[PDB]
Coordinates of C-alpha atoms and ligand atoms in Angstrom, one line a residue:
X2 CA -17.9 12.1 12.4
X3 CA -15.1 14.1 11.4
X4 CA -12.7 11.2 11.2
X5 CA -15.0 9.8 8.4
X6 CA -14.6 12.8 6.5
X7 CA -10.8 12.7 6.8
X8 CA -11.0 9.2 5.2
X9 CA -13.0 10.5 2.3
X10 CA -10.5 13.4 1.7
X11 CA -7.5 11.1 2.2
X12 CA -8.8 8.5 -0.3
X13 CA -9.8 11.0 -2.9
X14 CA -6.4 12.8 -2.7
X15 CA -4.6 9.6 -3.0
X16 CA -6.7 8.6 -6.2
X17 CA -6.4 11.9 -7.9
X18 CA -2.4 11.9 -7.1
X19 CA -2.4 8.4 -8.8
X20 CA -3.8 9.9 -12.2
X21 CA -1.4 13.0 -11.9
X22 CA -3.8 15.5 -10.4
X23 CA -3.2 18.2 -7.7
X24 CA -5.0 17.4 -4.4
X25 CA -5.0 18.6 -0.8
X26 CA -4.4 15.5 1.3
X29 CA -1.8 10.5 6.1
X30 CA -1.3 11.1 9.8
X31 CA -3.4 11.4 12.8
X32 CA -5.6 8.9 14.6
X33 CA -6.8 7.4 11.4
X34 CA -3.4 6.6 9.8
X35 CA -3.8 2.9 10.0
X36 CA -7.4 2.9 8.6
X37 CA -6.3 5.4 5.8
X38 CA -3.6 3.0 4.8
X39 CA -5.6 -0.2 4.8
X40 CA -8.3 1.7 2.8
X41 CA -5.8 3.1 0.2
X42 CA -4.3 -0.6 -0.4
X43 CA -7.8 -2.4 -0.3
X44 CA -8.8 0.4 -2.9
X45 CA -5.9 -0.5 -5.2
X46 CA -6.3 -4.3 -4.7
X47 CA -10.2 -3.7 -5.6
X48 CA -9.5 -1.8 -8.8
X49 CA -6.8 -4.3 -10.0
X50 CA -8.4 -7.5 -9.5
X51 CA -12.0 -7.3 -8.5
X52 CA -13.8 -4.2 -10.1
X53 CA -13.7 -5.7 -13.5
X54 CA -16.2 -8.4 -12.4
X55 CA -19.0 -5.7 -11.8
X56 CA -21.1 -3.4 -13.7
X57 CA -19.6 -0.1 -14.3
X58 CA -21.5 2.3 -11.9
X59 CA -19.9 5.6 -13.6
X60 CA -22.1 4.6 -16.7
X61 CA -25.2 5.2 -14.5
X62 CA -24.1 8.6 -13.1
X63 CA -23.0 11.5 -15.1
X64 CA -22.2 14.4 -12.7
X65 CA -22.7 18.1 -13.9
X66 CA -23.1 21.2 -11.9
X67 CA -26.9 20.4 -12.0
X68 CA -26.8 16.9 -10.7
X69 CA -28.5 16.5 -7.2
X70 CA -27.0 14.5 -4.1
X71 CA -30.1 12.2 -4.4
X72 CA -29.0 11.2 -8.0
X73 CA -25.7 10.0 -6.4
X74 CA -27.4 8.2 -3.5
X75 CA -29.6 6.3 -6.0
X76 CA -26.7 5.0 -8.0
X77 CA -24.6 4.2 -4.9
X78 CA -27.5 2.2 -3.5
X79 CA -26.8 -0.3 -6.2
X80 CA -23.7 -1.3 -4.3
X81 CA -25.5 -2.1 -1.1
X82 CA -28.5 -4.2 -2.6
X83 CA -27.7 -7.6 -1.1
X84 CA -26.6 -5.6 2.3
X85 CA -23.5 -4.0 3.5
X86 CA -20.1 -5.6 3.6
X87 CA -16.3 -4.3 3.8
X88 CA -15.7 -5.1 0.1
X89 CA -18.9 -3.1 -0.9
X90 CA -17.7 -0.1 1.4
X91 CA -14.1 -0.4 -0.5
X92 CA -16.1 -0.4 -3.8
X93 CA -17.9 2.8 -2.7
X94 CA -14.7 4.7 -1.9
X95 CA -13.2 3.5 -5.2
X96 CA -16.4 4.6 -7.1
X97 CA -16.0 8.2 -5.6
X98 CA -12.5 8.3 -6.7
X99 CA -13.4 7.4 -10.2
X100 CA -16.1 10.1 -10.2
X101 CA -13.4 12.7 -9.1
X102 CA -11.0 11.5 -11.7
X103 CA -13.7 11.9 -14.4
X104 CA -14.7 15.4 -13.2
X105 CA -11.2 16.7 -13.6
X106 CA -10.9 14.8 -17.2
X107 CA -14.1 16.7 -18.2
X108 CA -12.8 20.1 -17.0
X109 CA -15.1 20.2 -13.9
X110 CA -12.4 20.2 -11.1
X111 CA -15.1 22.4 -9.1
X112 CA -17.2 19.3 -8.6
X113 CA -14.4 17.4 -6.7
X114 CA -15.2 19.2 -3.4
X115 CA -19.0 18.5 -4.0
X116 CA -18.3 14.7 -4.7
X117 CA -16.2 14.6 -1.5
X118 CA -19.2 16.2 0.5
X119 CA -21.7 13.8 -1.0
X120 CA -19.4 10.8 -0.2
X121 CA -19.2 12.1 3.4
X122 CA -23.1 12.5 3.6
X123 CA -23.7 8.9 2.4
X124 CA -21.0 7.5 4.7
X125 CA -22.4 9.3 7.9
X126 CA -26.0 8.6 7.3
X127 CA -26.1 5.3 5.7
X128 CA -22.6 3.7 6.5
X129 CA -21.7 5.3 10.1
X130 CA -24.3 2.9 11.7
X131 CA -23.4 -0.6 9.9
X132 CA -19.6 0.2 10.6
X133 CA -20.3 1.0 14.3
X134 CA -22.1 -2.5 14.7
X135 CA -19.8 -4.5 12.6
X136 CA -16.6 -3.8 14.7
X137 CA -15.8 -0.3 13.5
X138 CA -12.9 0.4 11.3
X139 CA -10.6 -1.3 13.7
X140 CA -12.1 -4.5 12.5
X141 CA -11.5 -3.5 8.9
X142 CA -7.8 -2.9 9.6
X143 CA -7.1 -6.3 11.4
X144 CA -9.0 -8.2 9.1
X145 CA -7.4 -6.8 6.0
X146 CA -3.9 -6.6 7.5
Ligands
LIG1 C1 -14.9 -7.8 -4.3 C2 -15.3 -7.9 -3.0 C3 -16.7 -7.6 -2.5 C4 -17.7 -6.9 -3.2 C5 -17.5 -5.7 -3.8 C6 -18.6 -5.1 -4.4 C7 -19.8 -5.7 -4.8 N1 -20.8 -5.2 -5.6 C8 -22.1 -5.3 -5.0 C9 -23.1 -5.3 -6.3 C10 -22.7 -4.2 -7.3 C11 -23.7 -4.0 -8.2 C12 -23.4 -3.0 -9.2 C13 -22.1 -2.5 -9.3 C14 -21.2 -2.8 -8.4 C15 -19.8 -2.1 -8.5 O1 -18.9 -2.5 -7.6 N2 -19.5 -1.3 -9.5 C16 -18.4 -0.4 -9.7 N3 -18.3 0.3 -10.7 C17 -17.1 0.9 -10.5 C18 -16.6 2.0 -11.5 C19 -15.5 2.7 -11.1 C20 -14.9 2.6 -9.9 C21 -15.3 1.7 -8.9 C22 -16.5 1.1 -9.3 S1 -17.3 -0.2 -8.4 C23 -21.4 -3.7 -7.3 C24 -20.4 -4.1 -6.4 N4 -20.0 -6.9 -4.2 C25 -19.1 -7.5 -3.5 C26 -19.4 -8.9 -2.8 O2 -19.1 -10.0 -3.2 O3 -20.4 -8.9 -1.9 C27 -16.9 -8.2 -1.1 N5 -15.6 -8.6 -0.8 N6 -14.8 -8.6 -1.8 C28 -13.5 -8.9 -1.7 C29 -12.4 -8.0 -1.1 C30 -11.0 -8.4 -1.3 C31 -9.9 -7.7 -0.8 C32 -9.9 -6.3 -1.4 C33 -11.3 -5.6 -1.4 C34 -11.7 -5.2 0.0 C35 -11.5 -6.6 0.8 C36 -10.4 -7.3 0.7 C37 -12.7 -7.6 0.3 C38 -12.4 -6.6 -1.9

C-alpha cells in the first residue's frame, strides 16, 4: 500500500533530521499514524533499545548488499512472532541503517533502504497489521 510507503519515508526523514541530515519528508490521511510512530520510535530508542542485541552489527550495507541479506537480519526481530513493539523496533532499525549510510558517505543507499523497508513491510507486515486492528489500533493503544 502507498500509505505504508508514506510511513517509511516519513519516519526515515524524521530520523535523518534528528541527526542533522537533509531529507525529503507530516500531513494526509496517515498524519496521526506518522505522529504515533515518530513518538514510539523516540521512546523505543531512549528506554527500550539498549535491552536488545544491536542488529546493525549483523548487517553492513554496501552497494553490493542484496535485499535478502536485509530480510534475513530483520527476521531476527520477528522470531517470537509479530507485535507492535517489534514493528517499532523495525522502523527504528531502518532509521539507524540510513543514519550509518550517510555517516559512511553512502547517502545513495538511503533510497534503497527505504524501498527495502517498504518491501518487507508490505510482504511480511501488511497482513499481520490488517488482522490485528490496523494502524488505527496502534494509534489508540499508544495514545
Ligand atoms: C520494547 C517492546 C517490545 C519489543 C521490541 C523488540 C523486541 N525484540 C525482538 C527480539 C530481538 C532480537 C534481536 C534484536 C532485537 C532488536 O530490536 N535489536 C535492535 N537493534 C537496533 C539497532 C539500531 C536501531 C534499532 C534497533 S532494534 C530484538 C527486538 N521484542 C519486544 C518484545 O518485548 O516482544 C514490545 N513491546 N515493547 C514496548 C513498547 C513500549 C512503548 C514504546 C515502544 C512501542 C510500544 C509502546 C511498545 C515499545
